[PDB]
Amino acid sequence: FDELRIGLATADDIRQWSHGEVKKPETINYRTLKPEKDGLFCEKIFGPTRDWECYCGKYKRVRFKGIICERCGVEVTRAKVRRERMGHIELAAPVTHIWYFKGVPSRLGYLLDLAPKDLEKVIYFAAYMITFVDEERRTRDLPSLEAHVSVERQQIEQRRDSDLEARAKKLETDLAELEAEGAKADVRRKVREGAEREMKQLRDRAQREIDRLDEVWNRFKNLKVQDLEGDELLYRELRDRFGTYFDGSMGAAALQKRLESFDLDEEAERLREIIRTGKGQKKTRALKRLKVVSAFLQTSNSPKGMVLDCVPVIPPDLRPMVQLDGGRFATSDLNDLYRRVINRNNRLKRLLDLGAPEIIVNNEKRMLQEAVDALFDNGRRGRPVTGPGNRPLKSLSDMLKGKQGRFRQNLLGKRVDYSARSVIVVGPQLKLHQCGLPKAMALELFKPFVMKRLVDLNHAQNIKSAKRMVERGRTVVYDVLEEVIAEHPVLLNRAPTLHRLGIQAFEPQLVEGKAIQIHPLVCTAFNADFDGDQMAVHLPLSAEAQAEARILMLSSNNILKPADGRPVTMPTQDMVLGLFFLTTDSEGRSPKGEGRAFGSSAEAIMAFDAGDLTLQAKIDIRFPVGTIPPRGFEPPAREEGEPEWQQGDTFTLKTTLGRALFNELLPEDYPFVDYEVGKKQLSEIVNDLAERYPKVIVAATLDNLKAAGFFWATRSGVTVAISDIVVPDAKKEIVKGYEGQDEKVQKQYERGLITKEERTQELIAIWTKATNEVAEAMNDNFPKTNPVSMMVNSGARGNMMQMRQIAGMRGLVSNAKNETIPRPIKASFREGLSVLEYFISTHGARKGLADTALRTADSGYLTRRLVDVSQDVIIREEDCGTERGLKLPIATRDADGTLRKAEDVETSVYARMLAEDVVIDGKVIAPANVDLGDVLIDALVAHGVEEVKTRSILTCESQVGTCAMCYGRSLATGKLVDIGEAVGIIAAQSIGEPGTQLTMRTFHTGGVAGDDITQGLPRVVELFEARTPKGVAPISEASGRVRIEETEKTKKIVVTPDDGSDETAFPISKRARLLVGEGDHVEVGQKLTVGATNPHDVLRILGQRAVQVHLVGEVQKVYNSQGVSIHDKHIEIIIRQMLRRVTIIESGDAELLPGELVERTKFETENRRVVQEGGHPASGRPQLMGITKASLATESWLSAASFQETTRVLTDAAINAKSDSLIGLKENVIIGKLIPAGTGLSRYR
DNA sequence: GCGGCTGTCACCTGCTCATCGTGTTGTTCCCA
DNA sequence: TGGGAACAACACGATGACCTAAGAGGTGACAGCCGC
Ligand SMILES: [Mg+2]
Ligand SMILES: [Zn+2]
Ligand SMILES: [Zn+2]
Structure with a gap:
């Protein structure tokens, strides 16, 4: 299991997977309830439905093993093969894959430059497209062809002039003869109107047809590949007139022909030329297309896999149909979609056999295209294909994405054996490492051990008798359960696990009752109050599992929280x-x-x-x-x-x-x-x-x-x-x-x-x-x-x-629509609220209840994103030999010239080791790289320092990720951080735990908008996503003289810098409450109006230490305004992950593409290489990513697919043919392997 | 050639059951 | 096992001609298409 790769699936690959072809749209016989032949759920192509049996029955005897039957064609083997065996269906008309085409823009192909509408028209048989033109032969015969067209124009003019002579004769004849007759007062004028009608009709019709020929001629003259004839009549005219020079088609056949003929080297060449010399949007489009073109060019996987001629069928047991009571059948939606595609494929084959007209075959081919599209993704285009009710059917790609998809419901989180639950009650007589668990629960969880002990203790002669007696609940069973539960640690757990101290190991003691007895003071780690709460419970089995349980997870060891280090x-x-x-x-x-x-x-x-x-x-x-x-x-x-x-x-x-x-x-x-x-x-x-x-x-x-x-x-x-x-x-x-x-x-x-x-x-x-x-x-x-x-x-x-x-007094309360009632509640609950007072008071209660209900899920999503970003930042190095660090204020707040410990040394400077020895009086007050506890704080504040240089992850420079010494001491264990510590998950959980209890949002509207930036968890997501703050305020680019150039149409604030610099301006709203006066001296890193500075600006004009400081301070602002306390390290982990990539420019020399947010590490190594060769290196603008984006940019595609955007991620991974190496946490729990953290590291393995 | 804006793609969330259009053929039953 | 009768298959193609209701999300990110 070294790696796992995905690319494009050719027709040959699909044919190689399969064992037979599904030819019939039939699942089973409704009467005899058996598989049919060459249909869905078939037994000849898939495996036998019954173990060691065959369809007809000649080899229904179990003795046979692995032979092929001679009548029905079913081999004799196990019945689980139906989970593994696959089939295919050969399509008559090739169709496009709804993923690789008609999908997300960056993955929309772009190998053939075509707008989404043009492909919408071509694919769904609504417009033609040219796959080939003989331009050289067209130019060679252009003398002959233009001479021929001139000859046809002259023949049209000759017959038109003969018809004009005939028209003159007709006009003369009718005028003269009607005038001679004189049947009416205006016979000559009436037939003059008639003859003028005929003459005008012939004039206009001759003009129409010569213009038709001119249109056909000039269209043929300007005729190139990837050109669409929307009107079929004009295409018919062209084919009749100048055929044999160009070739056209409709649908995915044209695309297949282009992807076969079209070669990518020359396209990549022109794209490199244009991106080298490009202006504005054109260059961006060129590089966007170059991404896909290079993806296909570098790899061996050909683009022809993007059009499908064979469709594989998932094994039947993964899409089963089962007899429901009442004579009914519950079947998978995939069966319905496969039936649709097979129906339309067979009808198309029939239509082809009969030589049906173009219209009918085109309609059937379009329908087959839409059917395969629904099979792969039901909702992308058009209306969805509903199933039994009005609800949409389930597509093969709808089974991978979403909350309930395969990844996020079956590979990360599984229902497990040897598990139980029940309500939780307080046992105040328990030791810290003890839990009392009900009798029936303990009996059920420990069953096999109980049977083994009963047999060994001679209470039973056989295992089955032991099982019988255990079911009967004898007394000796209960004594043996008491004997056996000892020395078997038991992992207790509560439903919302907001941090690692939410699953804890206890020593189980056998207790009566129907509820689980828990210690009174472990109710804060679990947040478990005895109001009907419930606790789940699990039983480790292997020696290693329970050894880890007792050593690492035991409740006696877990006394300190990991968020801040205070005891919990x-x-x-x-x-x-x-x-x-x-x-x-x-x-x-x-x-x-x-x-x-x-x-x-x-x-x-x-x-x-x-x-x-x-x-x-x-x-x-x-x-x-x-x-x-x-x-x-x-x-x-x-x-x-x-x-x-x-x-x-x-x-x-x-x-x-x-x-x-x-x-x-x-x-x-x-x-x-x-x-x-x-x-x-x-x-x-x-x-x-x-x-x-x-x-x-x-x-x-x-x-x-x-x-x-x-x-x-x-x-x-x-x-x-x-x-x-x-x-x-x-x-x-x-x-x-x-x-x-x-x-x-x-x-x-x-x-x-x-x-x-x-x-x-x-x-x-x-x-x-x-x-x-x-x-x-x-x-x-x-x-x-x-x-x-x-x-x-x-x-x-x-x-x-x-x-x-x-x-x-209760006081003022939040009125409806988030206002303040003028009249308050002038009465406490003891005195008794009136009727209207109670009715007014319920507003805020309802609002708070709804707010909590939503904020639970909001904080859950935030924690999911934080975990996905920060995961795999694991302590792999005991000590990098760095000497760099942060200059943190050790003892600031010299109000009246008094050195006082800062108000937040507990979160910021505590637990962070020291870069180098600190000397103020010629002697070492604090030695280097020693835990920075309070005693050192008192020493340094007494001696007068105002800063300290601490090792940190942000300044850590280690070959293998992060190092223990730079991170500091684990706030949970107290000692030095151990190598293999999943620090990223700890930081994410630490930031996510208080998310539910923030409760920061405007009590009342207050007639203010824009000025009030988002408060609370919205603010935290705003900072962590790198999203521009709602109440944005510009920040001066350079020190300068700033004044106001306010215009009634549009207010403006303009700063011109000194030192011979160019001027800059900011458009500002009328309501700006400016904090900088006019004609004043601003500096390089100062704000202009009241608002929330962009992190992007602070990274651009100030630097990287500035953006780190700003982000940490801004998140801690709300967190410590609530009173929540999180160490700054847990934020620093996320900030380090957010600044790990750089957007590259001037990149032709360094052998990569401008943009692409090359990794900082990558940028540096390849610049080193290009400088080693001799060419100068490319340049890089530091970039502050978000959390979703920084997570989706993972090298491993398993993790990115698991997190979000499964369709887009998997499509890009297939186009790139990029493999995934096992390294990682998430992608190692998908495959079910020992994580590269904790005791699973190869050193401990 | 470069803007607006304008959609389109991501995320966040959860036991009842109504008929045709005729006519015929062959098997497979039900009774005796 | 005779007739009497039930389902699954088939082959054709009854002088007349068009849906249906359901249906209030929200917020980002972005690339097109249309306008200058
Ligand atoms: Mg409770
Ligand atoms: Zn057989
Ligand atoms: Zn380090």
């Missing part, structure tokens, strides 16, 4: 509300025994049980040898002449009992903790534990924290009641006064001083003031010991706006 499996909700109650202060908690001193914590809990001490009362507790005091409290160590071993001596601390209990959950070596560990400090402590202590102890500490959090959450006293929702007394008076102001504004509106818009905006301002005032008063009112206050301030569940709506 940490306590939350009630657990944190319990540890917060444990370590909170004594405020409003009526302490007892405050100020007392205890000789141990055991004595403290004695006092607590006695009821004379509180868990949260300030008391002086002594801690024994081993306890490590707080880091902050150490410098206030006990005063004594002797040197006290603060690290390892008994000490005393004015702590609280709850904190002394909390610090027993953490490991003994951990320093004491003496502050409210609500939610954020717990995250910090868990991060420190993960980054400092080994994983087993971190899991044990997490378990202890879980147990303590639940235990103390039960006793916290947090219980929601209608009194615990405290409506502030402030709300009444505030809402009444602002209501009075609203009344005044309404009165001044109804009096006519203001407009309705002014009244609105005034009331929105008034009620925003009222809402915020009530919010702050509500925050002030409740104590900090309140239930809701406790769960919010502890960071368990809740925000302050939610509390505002519940307790104080």
